[PDB]
Amino acid sequence: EIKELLKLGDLPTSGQIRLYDGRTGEQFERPVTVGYMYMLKLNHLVDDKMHARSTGSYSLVTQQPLGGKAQFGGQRFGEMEVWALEAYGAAYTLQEMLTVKSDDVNGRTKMYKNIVDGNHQMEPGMPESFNVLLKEIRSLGINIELEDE
Amino acid sequence: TEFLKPRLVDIEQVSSTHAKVTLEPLERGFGHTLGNALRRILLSSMPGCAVTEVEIDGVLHEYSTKEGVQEDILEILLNLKGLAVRVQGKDEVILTLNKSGIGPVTAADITHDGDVEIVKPQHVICHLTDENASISMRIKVQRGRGYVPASTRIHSEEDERPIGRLLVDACYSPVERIAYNVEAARVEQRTDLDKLVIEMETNGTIDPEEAIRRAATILAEQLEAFVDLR
Amino acid sequence: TEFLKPRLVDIEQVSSTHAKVTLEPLERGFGHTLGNALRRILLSSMPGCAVTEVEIDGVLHEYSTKEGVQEDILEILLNLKGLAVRVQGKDEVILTLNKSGIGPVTAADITHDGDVEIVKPQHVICHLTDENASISMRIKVQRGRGYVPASTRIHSEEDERPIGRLLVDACYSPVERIAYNVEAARVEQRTDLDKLVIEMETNGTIDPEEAIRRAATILAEQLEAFVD
Amino acid sequence: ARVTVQDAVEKIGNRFDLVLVAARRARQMQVGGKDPLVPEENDKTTVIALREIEEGLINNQILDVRERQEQQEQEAAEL
Amino acid sequence: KPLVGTGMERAVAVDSGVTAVAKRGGVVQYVDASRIVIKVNEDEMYPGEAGIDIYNLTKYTRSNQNTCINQMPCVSLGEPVERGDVLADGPSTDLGELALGQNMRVAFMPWNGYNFEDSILVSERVVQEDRFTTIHIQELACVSRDTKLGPEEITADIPNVGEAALSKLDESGIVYIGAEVTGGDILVGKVTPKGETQLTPEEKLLRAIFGEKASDVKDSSLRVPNGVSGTVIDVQVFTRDGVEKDKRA
Amino acid sequence: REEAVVWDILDEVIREHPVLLNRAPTLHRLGIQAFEPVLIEGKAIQLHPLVCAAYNADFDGDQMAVHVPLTLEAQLEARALMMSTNNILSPANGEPIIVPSQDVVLGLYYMTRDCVNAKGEGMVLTGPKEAERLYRSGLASLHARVKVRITEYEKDANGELVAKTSLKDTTVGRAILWMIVPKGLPYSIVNQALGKKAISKMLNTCYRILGLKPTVIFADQIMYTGFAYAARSGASVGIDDMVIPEKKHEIISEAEAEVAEIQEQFQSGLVTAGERYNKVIDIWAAANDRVSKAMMDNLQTETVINRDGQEEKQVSFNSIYMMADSGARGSAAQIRQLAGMRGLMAKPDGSI
Amino acid sequence: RQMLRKATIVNAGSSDFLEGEQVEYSRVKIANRELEANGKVGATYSRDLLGITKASLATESFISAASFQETTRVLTEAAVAGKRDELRGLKENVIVGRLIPAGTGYAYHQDRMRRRAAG
Amino acid sequence: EEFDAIKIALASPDMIRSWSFGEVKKPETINYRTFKPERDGLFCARIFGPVKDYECLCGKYKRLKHRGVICEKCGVEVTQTKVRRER
Amino acid sequence: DDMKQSIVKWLFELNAKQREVLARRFGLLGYEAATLEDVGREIGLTRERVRQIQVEGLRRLREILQTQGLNIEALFL
Amino acid sequence: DIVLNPLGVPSRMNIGQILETHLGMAAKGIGDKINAMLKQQQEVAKLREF
Amino acid sequence: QDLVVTEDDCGTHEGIMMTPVIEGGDVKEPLRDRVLGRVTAEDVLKPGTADILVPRNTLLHEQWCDLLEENSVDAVKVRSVVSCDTDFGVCAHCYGRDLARGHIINKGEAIGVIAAQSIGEPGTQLTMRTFHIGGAASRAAAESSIQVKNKGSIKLSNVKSVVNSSGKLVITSRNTELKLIDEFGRTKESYKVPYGAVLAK
């Protein structure tokens, strides 16, 4: 029925046509299927999804940066993503992600100052999430102490 | 080099919009060389005139609706994009359109300015429903080339922001369609000699003949750079 | 019209044969417009000289084998296609090649001829195995343009065609390869702006620089018919 | 190099040590303002250290030897 | 409309309710980009009440997903219509049929990896024709609250603000209807009472240098979110009963 | 204020600075890779095709995380350990993960594969350059049989490369692909019709003979040429491309009366639910294979092309067959459901 | 290999083995090397297979055991034993936000282990 | 700080007392009107530390000049607010 | 940090008589932010002298602003 | 207007899009004939026939 | 997580004898590919025992592997991670090539993580992958008859069968492995015969 309708339009029964490349002007070496597809623009616009963050506000307890574009959030560096750095060598990239990029409060400001000073040096510290963990275990009535060198 | 130049032979003008142009004689392979090169300039580079800014009295933004008018302002603006205009002397002209009463507002209701020429006076712009309703607007037509969207134009100059100016897309490019066919020109001796048949389809403004002349001019201008500087 | 002209920027000449040419700045779409237009002229319109006809004594057809010669006649002819020739005055010259004894027959063994200049005299043509073997041929070089195959020449020209005249492909075009690349030229303001990178590969008779100049000249000569 | 760091791995061997040594050298140029042995050619301190390692000018042992030399010159000056 | 449909297109457009449908029919007395008045036919028209149906059309309104809801009139002035005829098209409807998007000339063939894994290569002509250009109506609220320090003020008088910014705000501190705005532009000026600011010595010096003490007040103005840019179509003011109304309200 | 001088400074900072791209889920280490960034106008991240395999990235709306290695150490670990170029082989199995697919495979397949005579059968060329010039001039098909003279470079006992010149019986297309092929490799690599399976071997061979930088360049070249010729080809999908075997209805009516006879024998007494389930599944499973093999004979060849005089058989250039045989996308299993018989479907329990 | 980490021991050596303590294979081999050179009570051993979940909980790091699963139970058993985690593993170091003992960190980490010998 | 290992053990009643800086007697959080910490409540400044950096509750000592200066009147140490995450 | 560091350098750029007043009063290099009377009593200066040193200190800052004011003029939004 | 990839069809086994495309062109074919007859005015009788 | 390359060479002779996986006639996985990139041991020479062919500490490159195929070595003791003596990690030699790099593994590389990831990935990928992509199940159950592809002599290892009144060998063993030997005497095809089978020969 579709081929019969095409013949009524004087269009090809194959519904393939000769096409010419706009750039070269030369023909494509075989017939191409051309016609009308009804297309939809979905709600997923890049405008709404594009997001980027260098430094921003930080979470209340854990001191890690917030999540989500509405809260101007850093992307979550998950277990899965950490393991990838473990498989590689990448130990400095991982420490970065754990410390000056997340909790380490003194570390992040100090390294920001170094990057504007053009030092590109880390100077790592202690992640505030761990300080909390300690306090949460002592709140359970378990003595958890750091034993020195 | 037994150099063999083509010359413009036949200009079938089927309509003011559509015009076929045969071209001969062409040496083998120059049919496609000139055919595509010209098609590309004729689509992307052709200079023309188009509506850039529209200011309607009693209208602050393009999303509002004016009473006594069937079409929302957006739909009116889209009709003004299709308004075919020639400016003779100046690069920028502001035309005034004041009309009232029941009727389809056409392009002829714009105050005919001396140098400016409206190619399609019957072009529909607005439908006025109630007789008491009157519409008044100032349509700015600028000359440029190619396609300049209002979104690309709302992130460049913007030296003055007069609350009242609406930016709408204006396809400067007069050329709507173009295709070239290489046919055999069974020449006196040569059978590989060919003709170039350019089917052009413009809106108003540019003359087919004049447009081809201009496009060939632009290409030859760009070659001066290579023939000259080594 | 805010016209935006390109200018010839860099000419990396990797070799006399191969030369890369960057070109900027070009407006959007002119990269392919100029790129292809020039590619087509440089392949099928670059005028040059090439071997059209070869007559070897003791050879009636190109499929035979001559004793004392390693290569079949076809393979010899294919080497003569690669023979780089300049004719100064005349449009057609017949060069003679007579040589004997054990050794690689080179292009230097062809009898000079005043106006004609052989660009690659060390070009291998034939290998002679036995010392008693001698090879003699009359090689016709015509000037034309583009690529004229022997199959497209027999279909058009059907005049004089006696047996023995060996017809081989004559790549008149001094241009062996050409390709153009459009790269983005991030320009003061425009990111739409592009550069045109033309890689040319010729044989040595014609200069990459001068070949490009010539192709553009022929292209602008065709635009003289469109008045302005 | 510019594209790929395979040649510089072939000089030292351990990818991990390549990174330490290129780091140490890049730090010298970053902080000390040590002059580069190869023309800079608008290259970042990361890439210049890898060039120097590729050509075999920079190395853990060589860096240690020159550290001792500058350090002993400073001891000489203090005494 | 969809060129290749099924027939459910019309059913869905009508039953969704987003289209204005004629209950009574008759002839259209008056079209407008706002309203449709139909004069009803005597056969359905009851002899009690006046027989003129008025359908008011909903103009460019916000959706829950911040899309645009706009009703345009389908019929022309003086058109005869039956019961159950579509009088006005909703947002994604053609003359009565459901129109979710736009049909296009498509060719199946590779390009230079520009359609690699389902990636789509589109002509500039699509953008030019403003097909798949979409309208998003976003609702931003500015709330004036009462704090322990005192009530927040919605004045145009805002500490540390350029004349460029205050140009677009009117007497009350509200942006004008029709005004184009871009990220960081102030929409509704708001200031919050600050309790006694014990300053760092630097800030004491800095506030002394400009003398812009700017009273005991901060800047909490509602400003356009960063990178979103639009035209102000509408403004609404909700005030309490007791409190003296803004000039703009 | 996004001042014009700031763009120029930003361009200067990004130079030679690697950025980490991450896709969820990060299953194996290649789910993070480092790249040198290229500043682009527009809001979308542009990903290199060949690494789409490691990320399992398809561009129907997937997103990626970007992360900036700050320290000199982190920059170096990104450039040396985590760079795309340096992570070519899968750490799981020895094979290259960086492998052409889809358009690229189809294009190189289209170039290499041969046709009967076509334009300029049995010509002779001086090297791949005359071949390229012939094709682009329009005097030769990519599938023309011809004898070109290619000069391969074989490695010797030491590090020196040996040069060897000899006449090869291949096609125009394969000759032009030789131009991409680095020196060291044999011409026999390009002399077959290339599929994805052969191209993976090509890049592994090149990696073990020549080394990393050459394979990196060679990989990019393959991708560029593959897309480029894929587009030239204009290969597409019509409904007539899906060919149904003439002898489907016969196979099916035979299979269908057969299963009917076993269902009637079920009320009689030789059959449990399990026995008959197995017997019916066996009958339909063999019928499906039969109809599929009928479709694939009819489609794979069934190309009647007249060679220079008389008729010949050669492989079909039917679009979907080329897609399947090249391994560009669908498999024979998918094309069974398109053109042949869809087959026995399995319930959520797993029982069929 | 990680499954076959632990081993049960019969008899005593010079350390505290006695009947059927489960100790890691590496540590009992270390003991056996010094024992065979010096003598003392020889100790028969038998390698035990641990399947993944139990093998991960049998690790002599309680920070790794806790992070894995069963955190409440792990911390009670560690708290009662007065267990001391010297942080040899990767998870342990990632938790405290330190350099991994592997890849880039292996150089630095081995330098710290020799700093334990003096200063 | 840089440490070797970590140990875990049962908390002695007296161990728990060591970490403590006071006994919270009352459930009182903060004052409904002056949203500041109540006497010996759960957010007591006298126990956990000052709400604002280097500032006592009743406001007698301000600025970084006053360091560890426990205000006699309200009983609040003039240190950083950070302490209320650790005490 | 940038502001606090600049101030130290700004103190050793103008006069030692004015920098002394502002350093001790604001509590920059000092400790207790001495008000008008305390600063006057120290240097032995008078109430009018406080206004004179203040006006001279602002003129010195105006010089830094027309040189490096590229940062101060940006405080106007 | 749009160039879509052939290889995202036989793998996907949504052949509907191809049939939609063939019919879509046939639909537009007849629209292009009616557009041509309306541009040249012609007869109401002839339009009615077609 | 803990498993890291700690040592270069523990100096171990011990290894796990890896045979060629020849299941279902056509060799499923060759011995060459199974011992490619793996350190050999126990002075694995060629058939004729009178000269060493391969050392006890070397890297099996594609070149060594191609030599192995000309001689047709079937069985090779190679050094493995399991038999490595290194305490608190494993030796570069027991492991062999870093398959991602194409050369001997670097000391300090976190091997365990790579192992877990690489076992885990395919499962997780093949879950979503085969499922959304297929509709029906195209299984083939017709495992009735063993037909042998290449001529040879029947080799039955592990088999206890009883002769039935048909003349035919009806197998009554549970584990039964029919092999196809050539001339020289190598194993080339395998075929799991079941219980209750009728053998032709």
Ligand SMILES: Nc1nc2c(ncn2[C@H]2CC[C@@H](COP(=O)(O)OP(=O)(O)OP(=O)(O)O)O2)c(=O)[nH]1
């Ligand atoms: N963990 C996880 N990964 C997912 C999930 N859905 C998709 N992904 C990832 C892995 C596959 C990848 C793309 O998903 P698709 O469904 O497009 O599958 P594909 O493998 O690309 O196949 P196709 O050729 O049909 O597009 O995205 C999900 O639910 N969980």
Ligand SMILES: [Mg+2]
């Ligand atoms: Mg998908």
Ligand SMILES: [Mg+2]
């Ligand atoms: Mg997807």
Ligand SMILES: [Zn+2]
């Ligand atoms: Zn107090």
